[PDB]
């Protein structure tokens, strides 16, 4: 209907609760392995944030896997920063991590993150 | 909160 | 870190994708039964929006159920309107449905929805 | 969009 009212803060309040569930390991259904490191998450949140995870978890075989191994070239700290961004909207971008965050966001297919990384690098040239 | 979207 | 940047639209863009997954029946993990009607959903979204579903899906036995039956007094249209609100932030509140939406929101423990229903009823007295 | 929160 075109006669709906809207609760402004609803989407933000939902995302905060999804991050609380992740913190407490409640109903997490996949482990992402990045070299020696492991990260527990919810497949639906990963798909909602990333073109790579959307493709993986809509595949008729990969949708049922409980472990996904990323390319060995991916930096674990870069992945951790992006997983935190998926669950909070906040990106911890610093001089010391920007190259790893940008390469990881290109692999994960997160376009707006790639674009702000490019802008911050260009400003320092 | 509530608004007209 | 206190040095994070924030993408304003991120939470809203995530919620839109969760509703698209529900529309296409992708990775839905529970059926909610309301008398003769059935509704497919994601347990994590239900818990993030409702005090009743948060209690149900954190229980050591009920967390594993694939079907949940609601009280026979609950109106299916009232439940459908609230499920759509959970996945969109938009509430289709009308003269013809407000009493059923308010009773359903009290049962589901959705406080801000109960509060706007009370305000709209009081204005018509 | 990006802002200082
Ligand atoms: C939240 C964030 N998501 C995405 C950012 C991005 O760069 N790419 C390339 C994505 C590619 C695919 C998806 N996932 C879906 C796409 C279409 N339909 C569905 Cl059902 C899903 C799901 N789940 C999400 C993203 C964003 N979206 C839009 C604007 C900004 N940020
Ligand atoms: C999105 C909406 N959620 C809720 C509205 C509401 O009236 N009640 C009583 C709730 C009760 C419980 C929960 N769920 C949780 C609570 C604490 N910690 C966790 Cl991990 C979860 C989860 N998942 C959500 C709601 C809202 N929250 C805050 C303000 C407005 N709307
Ligand atoms: Cl918290
Ligand atoms: Cl597996
Ligand atoms: Cl992005
Ligand atoms: Cl759509
Ligand atoms: Cl069952
Ligand atoms: Cl609410």
Tab-separated table of C-alpha atoms and ligand atoms in Angstrom:
chain	number	residue	atom	x	y	z
A	1	UNK	CA	0.000	0.000	0.000
A	2	UNK	CA	0.957	3.676	-0.630
A	3	UNK	CA	-0.598	4.656	2.772
A	4	UNK	CA	2.269	3.149	4.962
A	5	UNK	CA	3.981	5.023	7.869
A	6	UNK	CA	7.763	4.378	8.363
A	7	UNK	CA	9.900	3.926	11.538
A	8	UNK	CA	13.128	5.825	10.639
A	9	UNK	CA	15.554	3.905	12.957
A	10	UNK	CA	14.198	0.365	12.203
A	11	UNK	CA	16.922	-0.790	9.734
A	12	UNK	CA	19.753	0.465	12.032
A	13	UNK	CA	18.136	-1.230	15.113
A	14	UNK	CA	17.834	-4.557	13.169
A	15	UNK	CA	21.542	-4.389	12.118
A	16	UNK	CA	22.643	-3.746	15.743
A	17	UNK	CA	20.784	-6.918	16.846
A	18	UNK	CA	22.335	-8.979	13.973
A	19	UNK	CA	25.818	-7.886	15.241
A	20	UNK	CA	24.842	-8.829	18.859
A	21	UNK	CA	23.787	-12.304	17.596
A	22	UNK	CA	27.190	-12.645	15.802
A	23	UNK	CA	29.081	-11.543	19.005
A	24	UNK	CA	27.282	-14.285	21.034
A	25	UNK	CA	27.600	-16.927	18.236
A	26	UNK	CA	23.768	-17.286	18.017
A	27	UNK	CA	22.447	-19.070	14.866
A	28	UNK	CA	25.701	-18.479	12.908
A	29	UNK	CA	25.703	-21.015	9.994
A	30	UNK	CA	29.082	-20.651	8.239
A	31	UNK	CA	32.817	-20.377	8.972
A	32	UNK	CA	34.928	-18.236	6.542
A	33	UNK	CA	38.601	-19.399	6.509
A	34	UNK	CA	41.294	-16.828	5.540
A	35	UNK	CA	44.629	-18.637	5.755
A	36	UNK	CA	45.246	-19.435	9.452
A	37	UNK	CA	42.175	-17.454	10.626
A	38	UNK	CA	38.485	-18.411	11.041
A	39	UNK	CA	35.433	-16.079	11.169
A	40	UNK	CA	31.868	-17.195	12.117
A	41	UNK	CA	28.926	-15.412	10.419
A	42	UNK	CA	25.346	-15.590	9.060
A	43	UNK	CA	25.079	-16.481	5.312
A	44	UNK	CA	22.132	-14.037	4.807
A	45	UNK	CA	24.144	-11.014	6.100
A	46	UNK	CA	27.196	-11.955	3.925
A	47	UNK	CA	24.960	-12.268	0.782
A	48	UNK	CA	23.195	-8.940	1.541
A	49	UNK	CA	26.590	-7.099	1.620
A	50	UNK	CA	28.822	-8.782	-1.033
A	51	UNK	CA	28.524	-9.758	-4.711
A	52	UNK	CA	30.917	-12.692	-4.142
A	53	UNK	CA	28.926	-14.171	-1.200
A	54	UNK	CA	25.604	-13.573	-3.052
A	55	UNK	CA	26.932	-15.724	-5.949
A	56	UNK	CA	28.345	-18.443	-3.576
A	57	UNK	CA	25.264	-18.947	-1.395
A	58	UNK	CA	22.754	-18.935	-4.359
A	59	UNK	CA	24.762	-21.842	-6.005
A	60	UNK	CA	22.794	-25.164	-5.781
A	61	UNK	CA	25.819	-26.989	-4.185
A	62	UNK	CA	27.728	-24.204	-2.287
A	63	UNK	CA	24.526	-23.003	-0.484
A	64	UNK	CA	24.804	-26.140	1.750
A	65	UNK	CA	28.491	-25.823	2.739
A	66	UNK	CA	29.318	-24.942	6.387
A	67	UNK	CA	32.949	-23.850	5.588
A	68	UNK	CA	34.148	-21.500	2.780
A	69	UNK	CA	37.926	-21.097	2.069
A	70	UNK	CA	39.009	-17.735	0.583
A	71	UNK	CA	41.931	-17.236	-1.846
A	72	UNK	CA	45.350	-17.470	0.009
A	73	UNK	CA	46.247	-13.932	-1.226
A	74	UNK	CA	43.496	-12.390	0.998
A	75	UNK	CA	44.717	-10.577	4.138
A	76	UNK	CA	42.920	-11.753	7.379
A	77	UNK	CA	42.946	-8.241	8.980
A	78	UNK	CA	41.460	-6.764	5.744
A	79	UNK	CA	38.684	-9.392	5.834
A	80	UNK	CA	38.018	-8.763	9.594
A	81	UNK	CA	37.634	-4.953	8.960
A	82	UNK	CA	35.135	-5.646	6.111
A	83	UNK	CA	33.134	-8.228	8.137
A	84	UNK	CA	32.806	-5.617	10.963
A	85	UNK	CA	31.636	-3.023	8.347
A	86	UNK	CA	28.979	-5.494	7.003
A	87	UNK	CA	27.484	-5.827	10.535
A	88	UNK	CA	27.788	-2.121	11.646
A	89	UNK	CA	28.058	0.344	8.622
A	90	UNK	CA	31.368	1.529	10.154
A	91	UNK	CA	34.690	1.101	8.255
A	92	UNK	CA	38.024	1.331	10.162
A	93	UNK	CA	40.109	2.762	7.270
A	94	UNK	CA	43.729	3.722	8.189
A	95	UNK	CA	46.990	4.509	6.312
A	96	UNK	CA	48.390	1.124	7.475
A	97	UNK	CA	45.445	-1.006	6.243
A	98	UNK	CA	43.935	0.805	3.187
A	99	UNK	CA	45.763	-1.235	0.498
A	100	UNK	CA	44.676	-4.561	2.104
A	101	UNK	CA	41.065	-3.296	2.678
A	102	UNK	CA	40.781	-2.126	-0.984
A	103	UNK	CA	42.142	-5.446	-2.419
A	104	UNK	CA	39.764	-7.435	-0.154
A	105	UNK	CA	36.730	-5.259	-1.123
A	106	UNK	CA	37.552	-5.783	-4.863
A	107	UNK	CA	37.594	-9.613	-4.302
A	108	UNK	CA	34.361	-9.508	-2.222
A	109	UNK	CA	32.624	-7.228	-4.774
A	110	UNK	CA	31.772	-4.326	-2.379
A	111	UNK	CA	31.765	-1.373	-4.846
A	112	UNK	CA	31.165	1.646	-2.523
A	113	UNK	CA	34.019	0.498	-0.226
A	114	UNK	CA	36.384	0.214	-3.281
A	115	UNK	CA	35.299	3.753	-4.434
A	116	UNK	CA	36.061	5.466	-0.895
A	117	UNK	CA	39.434	3.599	-0.765
A	118	UNK	CA	40.348	4.981	-4.248
A	119	UNK	CA	39.340	8.548	-3.175
A	120	UNK	CA	41.417	8.400	0.072
A	121	UNK	CA	44.495	7.059	-1.843
A	122	UNK	CA	44.159	9.746	-4.611
A	123	UNK	CA	44.029	12.540	-1.929
A	124	UNK	CA	47.477	11.388	-0.550
A	125	UNK	CA	49.186	11.400	-4.030
B	1	UNK	CA	10.208	8.165	15.355
B	2	UNK	CA	7.478	7.569	12.734
B	3	UNK	CA	7.228	9.566	9.399
B	4	UNK	CA	5.352	9.755	6.066
B	5	UNK	CA	7.976	8.131	3.726
C	1	UNK	CA	38.305	2.210	16.700
C	2	UNK	CA	37.009	5.809	17.143
C	3	UNK	CA	38.475	6.753	13.691
C	4	UNK	CA	35.765	4.877	11.589
C	5	UNK	CA	33.893	6.433	8.594
C	6	UNK	CA	30.189	5.415	8.142
C	7	UNK	CA	28.111	4.605	5.000
C	8	UNK	CA	24.719	6.240	5.808
C	9	UNK	CA	22.486	3.987	3.597
C	10	UNK	CA	24.163	0.631	4.529
C	11	UNK	CA	21.552	-0.643	7.060
C	12	UNK	CA	18.623	0.225	4.708
C	13	UNK	CA	20.397	-1.469	1.714
C	14	UNK	CA	21.002	-4.649	3.824
C	15	UNK	CA	17.291	-4.773	4.874
C	16	UNK	CA	16.144	-4.421	1.224
C	17	UNK	CA	18.292	-7.460	0.281
C	18	UNK	CA	16.932	-9.506	3.260
C	19	UNK	CA	13.366	-8.807	1.946
C	20	UNK	CA	14.434	-9.840	-1.622
C	21	UNK	CA	15.803	-13.133	-0.185
C	22	UNK	CA	12.442	-13.695	1.632
C	23	UNK	CA	10.465	-12.939	-1.618
C	24	UNK	CA	12.514	-15.603	-3.508
C	25	UNK	CA	12.436	-18.116	-0.578
C	26	UNK	CA	16.284	-18.106	-0.350
C	27	UNK	CA	17.758	-19.596	2.885
C	28	UNK	CA	14.458	-19.209	4.818
C	29	UNK	CA	14.685	-21.582	7.859
C	30	UNK	CA	11.283	-21.444	9.600
C	31	UNK	CA	7.540	-21.555	8.864
C	32	UNK	CA	5.234	-19.497	11.185
C	33	UNK	CA	1.684	-20.993	11.287
C	34	UNK	CA	-1.238	-18.636	12.129
C	35	UNK	CA	-4.390	-20.755	12.016
C	36	UNK	CA	-4.922	-21.795	8.366
C	37	UNK	CA	-2.045	-19.601	7.084
C	38	UNK	CA	1.719	-20.232	6.710
C	39	UNK	CA	4.542	-17.637	6.455
C	40	UNK	CA	8.197	-18.465	5.557
C	41	UNK	CA	10.957	-16.332	7.154
C	42	UNK	CA	14.535	-16.107	8.513
C	43	UNK	CA	14.874	-16.776	12.301
C	44	UNK	CA	17.581	-14.047	12.672
C	45	UNK	CA	15.300	-11.293	11.231
C	46	UNK	CA	12.343	-12.401	13.459
C	47	UNK	CA	14.591	-12.343	16.609
C	48	UNK	CA	16.042	-8.909	15.676
C	49	UNK	CA	12.491	-7.397	15.510
C	50	UNK	CA	10.419	-9.141	18.251
C	51	UNK	CA	10.797	-9.896	21.974
C	52	UNK	CA	8.687	-13.064	21.562
C	53	UNK	CA	10.814	-14.502	18.695
C	54	UNK	CA	14.062	-13.504	20.505
C	55	UNK	CA	12.933	-15.617	23.513
C	56	UNK	CA	11.783	-18.574	21.285
C	57	UNK	CA	14.903	-18.901	19.126
C	58	UNK	CA	17.394	-18.504	22.080
C	59	UNK	CA	15.660	-21.497	23.877
C	60	UNK	CA	17.928	-24.629	23.819
C	61	UNK	CA	15.089	-26.807	22.326
C	62	UNK	CA	12.935	-24.312	20.292
C	63	UNK	CA	16.016	-22.913	18.422
C	64	UNK	CA	16.035	-26.172	16.352
C	65	UNK	CA	12.337	-26.250	15.358
C	66	UNK	CA	11.440	-25.637	11.671
C	67	UNK	CA	7.722	-24.848	12.422
C	68	UNK	CA	6.303	-22.478	15.108
C	69	UNK	CA	2.503	-22.391	15.807
C	70	UNK	CA	1.109	-19.072	17.121
C	71	UNK	CA	-1.853	-18.722	19.528
C	72	UNK	CA	-5.230	-19.367	17.696
C	73	UNK	CA	-6.455	-15.868	18.750
C	74	UNK	CA	-3.853	-14.194	16.443
C	75	UNK	CA	-5.229	-12.665	13.217
C	76	UNK	CA	-3.324	-13.834	10.037
C	77	UNK	CA	-3.671	-10.426	8.257
C	78	UNK	CA	-2.336	-8.654	11.410
C	79	UNK	CA	0.672	-11.014	11.448
C	80	UNK	CA	1.286	-10.521	7.659
C	81	UNK	CA	1.313	-6.664	8.096
C	82	UNK	CA	3.859	-6.974	10.971
C	83	UNK	CA	6.096	-9.461	9.075
C	84	UNK	CA	6.187	-6.979	6.118
C	85	UNK	CA	7.105	-4.157	8.594
C	86	UNK	CA	9.976	-6.298	10.058
C	87	UNK	CA	11.505	-6.672	6.543
C	88	UNK	CA	10.861	-3.073	5.244
C	89	UNK	CA	10.356	-0.491	8.139
C	90	UNK	CA	6.954	0.302	6.556
C	91	UNK	CA	3.682	-0.335	8.483
C	92	UNK	CA	0.345	-0.513	6.574
C	93	UNK	CA	-1.870	0.865	9.394
C	94	UNK	CA	-5.562	1.437	8.436
C	95	UNK	CA	-8.886	2.014	10.277
C	96	UNK	CA	-9.963	-1.542	9.293
C	97	UNK	CA	-6.836	-3.323	10.626
C	98	UNK	CA	-5.508	-1.226	13.581
C	99	UNK	CA	-7.145	-3.286	16.375
C	100	UNK	CA	-5.751	-6.575	14.939
C	101	UNK	CA	-2.272	-5.012	14.293
C	102	UNK	CA	-2.106	-3.634	17.890
C	103	UNK	CA	-3.157	-6.988	19.496
C	104	UNK	CA	-0.599	-8.862	17.330
C	105	UNK	CA	2.218	-6.367	18.179
C	106	UNK	CA	1.439	-6.772	21.943
C	107	UNK	CA	1.753	-10.613	21.579
C	108	UNK	CA	4.968	-10.316	19.489
C	109	UNK	CA	6.480	-7.757	21.917
C	110	UNK	CA	7.065	-4.915	19.374
C	111	UNK	CA	6.792	-1.851	21.687
C	112	UNK	CA	7.116	1.087	19.210
C	113	UNK	CA	4.385	-0.437	16.982
C	114	UNK	CA	2.050	-0.781	20.053
C	115	UNK	CA	2.799	2.897	21.020
C	116	UNK	CA	1.890	4.349	17.400
C	117	UNK	CA	-1.295	2.173	17.374
C	118	UNK	CA	-2.342	3.641	20.784
C	119	UNK	CA	-1.666	7.226	19.527
C	120	UNK	CA	-3.712	6.719	16.297
C	121	UNK	CA	-6.658	5.199	18.286
C	122	UNK	CA	-6.579	8.044	20.911
C	123	UNK	CA	-6.702	10.697	18.088
C	124	UNK	CA	-10.025	9.161	16.779
C	125	UNK	CA	-11.736	9.193	20.258
D	1	UNK	CA	27.420	8.595	0.971
D	2	UNK	CA	30.188	8.390	3.613
D	3	UNK	CA	30.243	10.571	6.840
D	4	UNK	CA	32.085	11.103	10.155
D	5	UNK	CA	29.618	9.366	12.582
E	1	LIG	C1	24.538	-3.555	1.162
E	1	LIG	C2	25.438	-3.444	-0.066
E	1	LIG	N1	25.303	-4.657	-0.887
E	1	LIG	C3	26.074	-4.869	-1.969
E	1	LIG	C4	27.094	-4.053	-2.369
E	1	LIG	C5	27.763	-4.199	-3.640
E	1	LIG	O1	28.607	-3.422	-4.063
E	1	LIG	N2	27.401	-5.314	-4.399
E	1	LIG	C6	28.050	-5.493	-5.696
E	1	LIG	C7	26.443	-6.249	-3.984
E	1	LIG	C8	26.098	-7.312	-4.816
E	1	LIG	C9	25.107	-8.203	-4.445
E	1	LIG	C10	24.437	-8.044	-3.237
E	1	LIG	N3	23.392	-8.942	-2.893
E	1	LIG	C11	22.149	-9.011	-3.517
E	1	LIG	C12	21.902	-8.332	-4.710
E	1	LIG	C13	20.661	-8.452	-5.306
E	1	LIG	N4	19.669	-9.202	-4.823
E	1	LIG	C14	19.904	-9.840	-3.695
E	1	LIG	CL1	18.630	-10.858	-3.109
E	1	LIG	C15	21.095	-9.781	-2.978
E	1	LIG	C16	21.256	-10.437	-1.712
E	1	LIG	N5	21.352	-10.965	-0.712
E	1	LIG	C17	24.786	-6.993	-2.390
E	1	LIG	C18	25.797	-6.094	-2.747
E	1	LIG	C19	25.006	-2.173	-0.873
E	1	LIG	N6	24.057	-2.355	-1.799
E	1	LIG	C20	23.735	-1.258	-2.499
E	1	LIG	C21	24.327	-0.037	-2.298
E	1	LIG	C22	25.285	0.017	-1.316
E	1	LIG	N7	25.647	-1.037	-0.575
E	2	LIG	C1	14.205	-3.659	15.781
E	2	LIG	C2	13.295	-3.570	17.003
E	2	LIG	N1	13.540	-4.720	17.886
E	2	LIG	C3	12.790	-4.947	18.978
E	2	LIG	C4	11.697	-4.210	19.339
E	2	LIG	C5	11.042	-4.352	20.617
E	2	LIG	O1	10.128	-3.637	21.002
E	2	LIG	N2	11.504	-5.389	21.431
E	2	LIG	C6	10.871	-5.560	22.738
E	2	LIG	C7	12.545	-6.251	21.063
E	2	LIG	C8	12.985	-7.233	21.948
E	2	LIG	C9	14.055	-8.046	21.621
E	2	LIG	C10	14.711	-7.888	20.404
E	2	LIG	N3	15.835	-8.702	20.104
E	2	LIG	C11	17.078	-8.624	20.728
E	2	LIG	C12	17.258	-7.864	21.884
E	2	LIG	C13	18.503	-7.837	22.482
E	2	LIG	N4	19.562	-8.516	22.036
E	2	LIG	C14	19.390	-9.231	20.943
E	2	LIG	CL1	20.754	-10.154	20.407
E	2	LIG	C15	18.200	-9.319	20.227
E	2	LIG	C16	18.104	-10.051	18.996
E	2	LIG	N5	18.060	-10.636	18.025
E	2	LIG	C17	14.268	-6.919	19.505
E	2	LIG	C18	13.177	-6.101	19.818
E	2	LIG	C19	13.606	-2.224	17.743
E	2	LIG	N6	14.565	-2.269	18.676
E	2	LIG	C20	14.782	-1.113	19.317
E	2	LIG	C21	14.080	0.036	19.055
E	2	LIG	C22	13.123	-0.049	18.074
E	2	LIG	N7	12.863	-1.170	17.389
E	3	LIG	CL1	25.527	-4.259	22.490
E	4	LIG	CL1	31.167	-28.016	4.554
E	5	LIG	CL1	29.992	-1.644	-0.142
E	6	LIG	CL1	13.336	-5.545	-5.481
E	7	LIG	CL1	9.880	-28.771	13.664
E	8	LIG	CL1	8.594	-2.198	16.998
